[PDB]
């Protein structure tokens, strides 16, 4: 299986209550290893996972320096955008940013990301060729012209391919016990009656990592995607993930339905009959 590393940063202005709050986190695949909160008294990058605190003070002081430089950059970006768009200073505004790289079962580069959003909408993003920028609006293309002239796309590509990947390959090593495990789901089925004329069949998947999974329902092999409720994939809190799918079926016909589960950790897809 391939792998990914991401850092997600959020900056929320709070007018009248002081300077914007900046939160940044980071992930290897679906596991978060770090945190920075601009309101925390620590003012340091912090370990969120048992395999990253084996790093030495050379790591944490250097990480801390870069994320706080990012923090003041995004804090100033909020005012530039506020002026770009002529928006009121009484409104709260949000700047989101994410970057990172993907690597394969080999360990070498696949793709990388450098991108920003403003009030939940795309602003400027590095194209997947990593040589050019997509820009949503007119204001973002000012930033595009400023960024193309200053050659930042060339420096970020150097980071994404060079530094991001080697740190990724290192974390996958420091933590290979937890990170490269794939736990298959524990799948079962529960039966909830409603009326005499109808009842609900629910198909569960529990304790699986990574989060990518597919649950589907079939009627006699006809794949019934109508009247099937399927919830978003929720974390269990111990590092694993959960999910379930359900169908309302007329009793007594529950025998004709089959749940279908596919996950990286399964040798072959599971099918379940009530």
């Amino acid at each position: 299986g391939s792998h990914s590393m991401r850092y997600f940063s959020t900056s929320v202005s709070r007018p009248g209550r002081g300077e914007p709050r900046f939160i940044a986190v980071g992930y290897v695949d679906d596991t978060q290893f770090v945190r920075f909160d601009s309101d925390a008294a620590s003012q340091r990058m912090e370990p969120r996972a048992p395999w990253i605190e084996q790093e030495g003070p050379e790591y944490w002081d250097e990480e801390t320096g870069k994320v706080k430089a990012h923090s003041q950059t995004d804090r100033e970006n909020l005012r530039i955008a506020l002026r770009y768009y002529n928006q009121s200073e009484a409104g709260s505004h949000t700047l989101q940013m994410m970057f990172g790289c993907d690597v394969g079962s080999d360990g070498r580069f696949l793709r990388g990301y450098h991108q920003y959003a403003y009030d939940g909408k795309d602003y400027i993003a590095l194209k997947e060729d990593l040589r050019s920028w997509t820009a949503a609006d007119m204001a973002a293309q000012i930033t595009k012209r400023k960024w193309e002239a200053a050659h930042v796309a060339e420096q970020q590509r150097a980071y994404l391919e060079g530094t991001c990947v080697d740190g990724l390959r290192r974390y996958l090593e420091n933590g290979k016990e937890t990170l490269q495990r794939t736990d298959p789901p524990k799948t079962h089925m529960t039966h909830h009656p409603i009326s005499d004329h109808e009842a609900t069949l629910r198909c569960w998947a529990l304790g699986f990592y990574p989060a990518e999974i597919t649950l589907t329902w079939q009627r006699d092999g006809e794949d019934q995607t109508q009247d099937t409720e399927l919830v978003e994939t929720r974390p269990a809190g111990d590092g694993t993930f959960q999910k379930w799918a359900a169908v309302v079926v007329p009793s007594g016909e529950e025998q004709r339905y089959t749940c279908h589960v596919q996950h990286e950790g399964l040798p072959k897809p599971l099918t379940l009959r009530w």
Partner: peptide, 11 residues
Amino acid sequence: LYKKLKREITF
């Protein structure tokens, strides 16, 4: 490993 630009650059 977090990103670092030699000179930080804004919007």
